Amino acid sequence: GFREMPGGPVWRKHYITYRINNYTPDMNREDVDYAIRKAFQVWSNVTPLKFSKINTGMADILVVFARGAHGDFHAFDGKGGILAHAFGPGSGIGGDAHFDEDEFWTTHSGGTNLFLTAVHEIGHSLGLGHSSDPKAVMFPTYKYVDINTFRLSADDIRGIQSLYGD
Ligand SMILES: COc1ccc(S(=O)(=O)N(Cc2cccnc2)[C@@H](C(=O)NO)C(C)C)cc1
Ligand SMILES: [Ca+2]
Ligand SMILES: [Ca+2]
Ligand SMILES: [Ca+2]
Ligand SMILES: [Zn+2]
Ligand SMILES: [Zn+2]
């Protein structure tokens, strides 16, 4: 059972921009770009949404790696516990995705997988809440799965399209 964030916030545009505010030292700069790019694509593939990376200017979605208290009244808790959090569509912090820098970000499973976490986070950026369906990416539980073969569950697609269709 997919859920939509309270209020049902959605982007009213299809051309959405994102920008990587900073890079975690755990991964190689380009692996980070790859992870996020691929994470956005997971959602582009099933909706009329198009995501474009920018390096300067104000992006709709800001991606940032932060530790503890980082200026949004949603403090991280050190390694473990909270992995990341994002905000529903809207201007300002809206759509932004934060990743706890106290976690160890990896391209695979050596620690916390950026890509997978990012897919789940971007789901929030777009207006999706937590799903009760345990096999949905929007399920509140982190669980590493093969990345090279990853695929959105029927629940996720059904939920994301109930907001933007396709
Ligand atoms: C697959 O991607 C994931 C990304 C982050 C997480 S998370 O464990 O950090 N988490 C979910 C959660 C689980 C259990 C209890 N409370 C909260 C945060 C969440 O939902 N972030 O988006 C929550 C504390 C705000 C889990 C999975
Ligand atoms: Ca943490
Ligand atoms: Ca924003
Ligand atoms: Ca780290
Ligand atoms: Zn934050
Ligand atoms: Zn979540």
Domains of the chain, by residue range, sit at: 1-166
Contact 54, 19 (CB under 8 A): yes
Contact 147, 115 (CB under 8 A): yes
24 C-alpha to center of ligand 1: Å? 19
CA distance 49 to 116: 19
Tokens in use for 132? Answer: 């009760």
The protein residue with its alpha carbon nearest to ligand 1, atom 8, reads 82
DSSP designation for 125: H
**Determination technique used:** X-ray
- Work out which ligand 1 atom sits closest to the CA atom of 83: 9
CA distance 21 to 53: 11
Displacement of CA 114 from its chain's centroid (Å): 9
- Which among 64, 82, 61 has a CA at the least distance from the CA of 140? 82
Q: What are phi and psi of 42, to 5 degrees?
A: -55, -35
Q: Which helix (H) or strand (E) holds 157?
A: helix 154-164
Partner residues linked to 145 by β-bridges: none
Q: What are phi and psi of 106, to 5 degrees?
A: -130, 160
Whether residue 100 has its Cβ less than 6 Å from ligand 1: no
Partner residues linked to 99 by β-bridges: 65, 84
CA distance 57 to 120: 25
Whether residue 144 has its Cβ less than 6 Å from ligand 1: no
3-state secondary structure of 4: strand
Contact 164, 46 (CB under 8 A): no
Task: Provide the resolution (angstroms).
Answer: 2.6
Within a 10 A sphere around the Cβ of 162, how many other Cβ atoms? 13
Whether residue 114 has its Cβ less than 6 Å from ligand 1: no
87 C-alpha to center of ligand 3: Å? 8
121 is catalytic: yes
Measured CA angle at 76 (ends 160, 71), to 5 deg: 90
- Which of 65, 87, 115, 121 is catalytic? The answer is 121
Tokens in use for 144? Answer: 């590493």
Count how many Cα atoms sit within 13 Å of the Cα of residue 158 in the half-sphere of its side chain: 9
Burial class (CB within 10 angstroms; exposed 0-12, middle 13-18, buried 19+) of 20: buried
Helices 114-125 and 29-44 pack at an angle, to 10 degrees, of: 50
- Domain 1-166: CATH superfamily, name plus number: Collagenase (Catalytic Domain) (3.40.390.10)
Tokens in use for 25? Answer: 């030292």
